[PDB]
Structure 1
Amino acid sequence: LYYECDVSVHEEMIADQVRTEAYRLGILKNWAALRGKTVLDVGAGTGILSIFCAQAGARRVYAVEASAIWQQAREVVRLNGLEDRVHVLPGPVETVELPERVDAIVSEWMGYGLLHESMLSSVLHARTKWLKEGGLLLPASAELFVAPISDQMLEWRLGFWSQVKQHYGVDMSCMESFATRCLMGHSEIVVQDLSGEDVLARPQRFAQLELARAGLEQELEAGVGGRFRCSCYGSAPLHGFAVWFQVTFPGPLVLSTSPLHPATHWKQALLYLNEPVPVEQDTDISGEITLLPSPDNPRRLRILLRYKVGDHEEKTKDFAME
């Protein structure tokens, strides 16, 4: 028979050793809080975090998964001999029925640019509905970072047209303005992995989310973000900004998606200006970044960028996730 199933997303998560080991160890570090306790895994996928929770000593784990992949999690649980302690429940966590309130929620809820897919809202729904007073959330907090970037790959792609003459004897340097309009003259957030070679100033933390804190659900609807200021390291074409995040598992173990840190499947969310802007050492850059639900679709990330480069006037660019 023929099927159509998608599977690349799950292989990307398990092949992400930074992601998977950070959760394994973040859960294990909370052994004392989890031993003999009950856990809700929100969006359990193929089930690995629920098993990690049982291996940290959880008495009972409720693995709630809305997509079709829940059946694989049920088989994974059985293969590991845990069917009597880890229960896989299909459907959205907003309507699942558990037999009891839980001592802890674990969830891999982060999307691209942290909030693309808006899954944090389901975790917070579950916290209100099912988490006992003073219960544990894993991870417990998230931080958002921004840095100006000179994207070396983008620089190469754009300049390559002016290199055609040296390789084939045909001048194509006019394709560079065309490529710039196509590659930068759009308002889509681009998900791409960078390295420190791309980072043009010290990264700035622009927001911090404590997931258990009162009022976070309303802050997500109104926009998460803040102002930033930095000074460029040296002369380069500024292509725009990268946004990334970290989350923290309390003891604290930090899972980072910085381009300065080991690569992860989340990569970074890139906010390209309409064209490159030349900067120099100590060029001041300031701005404000706000992460928002899209009006059409609360699960599609919108990012509003306000930015000022050196002496140029402040500009605004309103992005939505690709």
Structure 2
Amino acid sequence: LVERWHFIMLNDTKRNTIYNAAIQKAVCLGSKSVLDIGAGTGILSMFAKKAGAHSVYACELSKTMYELACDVVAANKMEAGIKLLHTKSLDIEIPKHIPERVSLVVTETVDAGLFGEGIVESLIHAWEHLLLQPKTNCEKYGKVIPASAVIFGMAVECAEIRRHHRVGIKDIAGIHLPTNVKFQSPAYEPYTTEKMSRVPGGYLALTECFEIMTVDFNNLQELKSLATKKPDKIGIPVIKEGILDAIMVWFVLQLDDEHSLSTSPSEETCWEQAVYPVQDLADYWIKPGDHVMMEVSCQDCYLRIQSISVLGLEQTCILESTEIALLNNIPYHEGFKMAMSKVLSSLTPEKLYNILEPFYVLDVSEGFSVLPVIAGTLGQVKPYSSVEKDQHRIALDLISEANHFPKETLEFWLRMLQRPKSDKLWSIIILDVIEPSGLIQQEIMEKAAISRCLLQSGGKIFPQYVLMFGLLVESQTLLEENAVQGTERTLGLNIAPFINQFQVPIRVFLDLSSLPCIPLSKPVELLRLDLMTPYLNTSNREVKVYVCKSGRLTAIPFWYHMYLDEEIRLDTSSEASHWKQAAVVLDNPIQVEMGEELVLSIQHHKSNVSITVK
């Protein structure tokens, strides 16, 4: 309900201090009438009032955030001086919502790409309807904090970004990906966002930092012009050999002459960068002498970088990032090849590489999957794909052709779980068990139980079972993302007890490998989800975890080993995993001692798992 950024930004003392100092300066120079656009909990509005502003107006788009801001403003005894408005800034009218035009607008409607929260649209409206005229004293003319911003770019090598946007291989577990199928991510999604200061495997600067654009938030003509301004065509010198994976983008906010904020990548700051993946080139290798060329525009809200190309000295298949990461997950496909060949082998080795009767193999993977083609290559197999999108069907037809399938070897199941034919049964059913989120898929136990009945004698659900592993960690990061840590970070203002009512018990879409934390235990098996034998499912159980190290336990990250058979397991935490992980974050951190035996109480019901300290 409450975006994680509200917790991180409220816990950033440095940022609170700098916004307070800028709002203080402006108010005491006589900006005593303030509109806070995107107020969240209302901390900037409370800075303005306490700085001596006469009237403060705070608008917030989210019902949840507006109600929270009402509660926080009241709790800090500022109900009377601060008018909270449940409204998009665009829908503020004078005198209906605000009595008079205001001397100061403060806005934190800002994303990693600066523009992605509609600031340009808001400030154009603000200048036109809501602000006093600009300077041609301070009580008599309109001004905006932030005043202006410089946007910076850098060409980078980053395999972690690459593996989500480009398919890196021509051959997966003995199937050929044909040249005549081009895979593109959806960023070909104007950008992704990334804490680049700790992206798994890091990044390499291939160019110097280069200025992309400047913006003056106090110049209405300039903001009005962005909409129709001709894209800047630019060309950036290469200073290092490497693979061109992305343009990394950040910015400096000038709040006023003396106060600025940088979203430059750093472990010292909370800020993320905008990331523009590079794809649909013949070659990605760049070296000193080359230029990185691109068009930069800001016409329809977002900063777009397009036509990214390298100046030196054919069916398209759109995949989600998860599906691109999947095709780049080699051990996943090699596991399936091996484990499928073993199940085929132990049921009819004669049909592995009644003659007319194949192995029937059903793939119920959620999205795009090449498992059926891999199954196809193993023996006399009739493989079934569960792809819905026409584009996926065409790609798989073309991949089939490239691996010497006769036409209509690969069948499409959608074009309910049922028998393959009237009096026939499945040799393998593949179920999708774990969400990209790192949570167990809903209704999986139902799908398993239905699927069990539809199997040939000695046939298998893949995976047969799944072990969930956990780790005791001390993570201040996970804590500061989860909960405001008291009053001192918000400069005495009392916000934590109100926002912390919206603590999430579980952080999903977590990159474990990147996480700054201290391990307090070794991995430990937390529960078994067994698709072949439901009786082995952990109902409710306690787990004794040996504490290897003294620390403040804040979280229990968790991932899965998915067993295709007893020898072959997939790791959702693997380097190349197309799954994210998750973590239980404690409402209250617990202190643990080396030698202690901590008890986790683990409640499991369907696809939901409670994990608690006892």
Residue identity matched to 1:213 = N
Unaligned runs of 5+ in 2: 134-140, 314-614
CA deviations over 1:237-278 (Å, ceiling 9, x no partner): 112322332211113322122235755454323232235611
- Aligned match of 2:121: 121
Match of 2:293 among 267, 281, 286: 286
- Aligned match of 1:296: none
- SS at structure 2 position matched to 1:149: strand
Do the aligned partners of 1:16 and 1:265 also contact (CA within 8 Å) in 2?
no
- Aligned match of 1:140: 147
Do the aligned partners of 2:296 and 2:303 also contact (CA within 8 Å) in 1?
no
Q: May I ask how many residue pairs the two structures share in their alignment?
A: 293
Please give the alpha-carbon distance, in whole angstroms, between the structure 2 residues aligned to 1:19 and 1:194. Answer: 18
Please give the alpha-carbon distance, in whole angstroms, between the structure 1 residues aligned to 2:298 and 2:286. Answer: 26
Taking the TM superposition and a 5 Å limit, the aligned residue runs for 1:1-322 are 6-7=1-2, 9=3, 11-16=4-9, 21-22=14-15, 24-35=17-28, 37-68=32-63, 69-96=65-92, 97-133=97-133, 134-155=141-162, 181=183, 183=185, 186=188, 188-195=190-197, 197-223=203-229, 226-259=232-265, 262-274=268-280, 277-293=284-300, 301=302, 303-311=304-312
Do the aligned partners of 2:165 and 2:279 also contact (CA within 8 Å) in 1?
no
- SS at structure 1 position matched to 2:39: coil
The offset of 1:105, in angstroms, is: 0.6
- SS at structure 1 position matched to 2:245: strand
The offset of 1:155, in angstroms, is: 4.9
- SS at structure 1 position matched to 2:227: helix
Structure showing greater radius of gyration is 2
Please give the alpha-carbon distance, in whole angstroms, between the structure 2 residues aligned to 1:101 and 1:54. Answer: 17
Please give the alpha-carbon distance, in whole angstroms, between the structure 1 residues aligned to 2:105 and 2:249. Answer: 26
User: Alignment identity in percent?
Assistant: 22
CA change 1:155–1:302 in 2 (3 A) is: closer
Do the aligned partners of 1:227 and 1:288 also contact (CA within 8 Å) in 2?
yes
The offset of 1:173, in angstroms, is: 9.5
Do the aligned partners of 2:49 and 2:56 also contact (CA within 8 Å) in 1?
yes
CA deviations over 1:57-97 (Å, ceiling 9, x no partner): 32321111232121111111011111122121222323332
CA deviations over 1:6-25 (Å, ceiling 9, x no partner): 32x1x323313697743541
The offset of 1:121, in angstroms, is: 1.1
| Aligned residues: CA RMSD | 3.5
TM-score, structure 1 normalization: 0.76
CA change 1:43–1:157 in 2 (3 A) is: closer
CA deviations over 1:168-226 (Å, ceiling 9, x no partner): xx957968999993558847522223248333211211211111114134223225863
- SS at structure 2 position matched to 1:14: helix
- SS at structure 2 position matched to 1:181: strand
Do the aligned partners of 2:66 and 2:84 also contact (CA within 8 Å) in 1?
yes
CA change 1:139–1:103 in 2 (3 A) is: same
- Of the structure 1 ranges 14-23 and 271-280, higher mean CA displacement relative to structure 2 is found in 14-23
Do the aligned partners of 2:102 and 2:131 also contact (CA within 8 Å) in 1?
yes
CA change 1:238–1:184 in 2 (3 A) is: farther
Residue identity matched to 1:42 = I
- SS at structure 2 position matched to 1:144: strand
Q: Larger relative CO (CA 8 A, sep 6+): 1 or 2? A: 1
- SS at structure 1 position matched to 2:297: strand
- Of the structure 1 ranges 178-187 and 279-288, higher mean CA displacement relative to structure 2 is found in 178-187
The offset of 1:45, in angstroms, is: 1.9
Please give the alpha-carbon distance, in whole angstroms, between the structure 1 residues aligned to 2:264 and 2:20. Answer: 22
Please give the alpha-carbon distance, in whole angstroms, between the structure 1 residues aligned to 2:131 and 2:305. Answer: 33
The offset of 1:40, in angstroms, is: 0.6
- SS at structure 1 position matched to 2:232: strand
Do the aligned partners of 1:141 and 1:247 also contact (CA within 8 Å) in 2?
yes
Unaligned runs of 5+ in 1: 1-5, 165-169, 294-298, 313-322
- Of the structure 1 ranges 253-262 and 145-154, higher mean CA displacement relative to structure 2 is found in 253-262
Segments of 4+ in structure 1 off by > 4 A? 17-20, 155-162, 170-180, 182-185, 260-263
CA change 1:253–1:198 in 2 (3 A) is: farther
TM-score, structure 2 normalization: 0.42
- Of the structure 1 ranges 234-243 and 68-77, higher mean CA displacement relative to structure 2 is found in 234-243
Residue identity matched to 2:235 = R
CA deviations over 1:17-57 (Å, ceiling 9, x no partner): 69774354134134232036121101212212212222333
CA change 1:150–1:259 in 2 (3 A) is: same
Do the aligned partners of 2:191 and 2:277 also contact (CA within 8 Å) in 1?
yes
- Aligned match of 1:319: none
CA change 1:220–1:213 in 2 (3 A) is: same
Please give the alpha-carbon distance, in whole angstroms, between the structure 2 residues aligned to 1:282 and 1:128. Answer: 48
- SS at structure 2 position matched to 1:129: helix
Please give the alpha-carbon distance, in whole angstroms, between the structure 1 residues aligned to 2:229 and 2:150. Answer: 14
- Of the structure 1 ranges 192-201 and 40-49, higher mean CA displacement relative to structure 2 is found in 192-201
